[PDB]
């Protein structure tokens, strides 16, 4: 978490380090009510951040 | 570095001709002298050693010589598998380097 | 004899690290002399630099020593490149072979080389 801002707006900002098996895009969720992700699907590149 | 100067840089040639390509070094390597073949597409391949001694499994048309800073690598008779690049390299003096290769194309 | 293999190729983002492993079948690294080459397509072939098998000393490119990392891994019989910084300047071809020189036979195995890309 680079930030977080407890708030009702999408205040909270996660970094995920990833290392893909191949490039393209995928889905992103959170099996629990604490935390809305404001994105449904995130794009990646081999190994990087998003 | 041990600069190696390869001559000619390109060379057209036909099946059945004599083709020599010469290698200079910046300083003396004795007869420790590499010659490589490379493809588009491929990696390069071990054609002599140590100046003068053919790779097993490599035709006896490719010959080697020289020793100091002067080296040759002879195709006595150029064969249509033959049309490639070549590389000198020498392992010698820090570092070991490649010569900046000799492209030969069919005429 | 030896046989070469490159890990798969793909992408570098500029200014991060390019990380390559090479592993070796049918023969042991307990001996000579293990080496990356690099070619930029259409281009000549630039020694990168070699570790010492038996003692596990390196040497590197002068042009490249700021940036370039090389190992050896006893555990999985293989051998790696780490290049810090990369920029579309180091786009190439990347070979591994037994490479600078061996105490009886060197640079006979060439790997047959993995696509590099630089891009953004």
């Known amino acids: 978490l680079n930030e977080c801002v407890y708030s009702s707006d999408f205040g909270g900002i996660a970094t995920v380090k990833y290392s893909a098996s191949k490039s393209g895009k995928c889905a992103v969720h959170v099996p629990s009510g604490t935390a809305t992700l404001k994105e449904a699907a995130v794009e990646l590149t081999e190994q990087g951040s998003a | 570095d041990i600069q190696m100067t390869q001559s000619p840089s390109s060379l057209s040639a036909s099946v059945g001709d004599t083709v020599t390509i010469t290698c200079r070094a910046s300083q003396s390597i004795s007869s420790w002298l590499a010659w490589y073949q490379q493809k588009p597409g491929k990696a390069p391949n071990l054609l002599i050693y140590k100046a003068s001694s053919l790779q097993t499994g490599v035709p006896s048309r490719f010959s080697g010589s020289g020793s100091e800073t002067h080296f040759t690598l002879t195709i006595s008779s150029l064969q249509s598998e033959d049309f490639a690049t070549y590389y000198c390299q020498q392992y010698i003096s820090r570092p070991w380097t490649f010569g900046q290769g000799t492209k030969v194309e069919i005429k | 004899q030896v046989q070469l293999q490159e890990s798969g190729p793909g992408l570098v983002k500029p200014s991060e690290t390019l990380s390559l492993t090479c592993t070796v079948s049918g023969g042991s690294i307990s001996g000579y002399y293990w080496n990356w080459i690099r070619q930029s397509p259409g281009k000549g072939l630039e020694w990168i630099g070699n570790?010492?098998?038996?003692?596990?000393?390196?040497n590197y490119n002068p042009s490249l020593k700021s940036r370039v990392t090389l190992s050896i891994d006893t555990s999985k019989n293989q051998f790696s490149m780490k290049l810090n910084s990369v920029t579309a300047a180091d786009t190439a071809v990347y070979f591994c072979?037994?490479?600078?020189?061996?105490?009886?036979?060197?640079?006979?195995?060439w790997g047959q080389g993995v696509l590099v890309t630089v891009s953004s």
């Open positions: 072979a037994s490479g600078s020189g061996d105490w009886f036979g060197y640079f006979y195995r």
């Open positions: 570790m010492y098998d038996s003692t596990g000393d390196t």
